Amino acid sequence: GYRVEADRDLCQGHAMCELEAPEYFRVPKRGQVEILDPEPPEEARGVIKHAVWACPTQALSIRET
Ligand code: F3S
Ligand SMILES: [Fe+3]
């Protein structure tokens, strides 16, 4: 039970999140990051932390619900 949060004022479009977890983050060429699942399964928490770590602006975050 967690939610993937994106500080959209901080996303500069590096698209490192899509390279680390492509199933859960998609970045349009002309758009910022799009969170495909806001409430992903518990098995996906590992690959999503990769995207949180790999964001140079730290726009992504995991919030426990
Ligand atoms: S800048 Fe944006 S495109 Fe992803 S790697 Fe960080 S949330
Ligand atoms: Fe890992």
Residue numbers in the entry: 2 to 66
From the publication, what sentences describe this entry?
To obtain a structural insight into a single 3Fe–4S type of ferredoxin, we determined a crystal structure of Fdx at 2 Å resolution. The observed overall fold is typical for the monocluster ferredoxins with two double-stranded antiparallel β-sheets and two α-helices. The structure contains four reverse turns: A, B, C, and E. Turn D is not evident in Fdx forming a loop. Turn C (residues 29–33) forms a rather noticeable protrusion from the surface of the protein. The protruding turn is adjacent to the iron–sulfur cluster and considered to be important in specific interactions with ET partners (discussed as follows). The [3Fe–4S] cluster is bound by cysteine residues 12, 18, and 56. The His15 residue does not form a hydrogen bond to S2 of the [3Fe–4S] cluster (distance of 3.6 Å); its side chain is turned away. Two main differences are the absence of turn D in Fdx and the position of turn C. In the Fdx structure, turn C is additionally stabilized by the interactions with turn A residues: backbone Val34 with Arg9 and Gln33 with backbone Cys12.
Ferredoxins are small iron–sulfur proteins and key players in essential metabolic pathways. For catalysis, CYPs required electrons typically supplied by redox proteins, such as ferredoxins. Interestingly, two Mtb 3Fe–4S ferredoxins, Fdx and FdxE, are co-located in respective operons with cytochrome P450 (CYP) enzymes suggesting their functional relevance. Here, we explored the genome context for two ferredoxins, Fdx and FdxE, determined the binding kinetics between FdxE and CYP143, and solved three crystal structures: Fdx, CYP143, and a complex FdxE–CYP143.
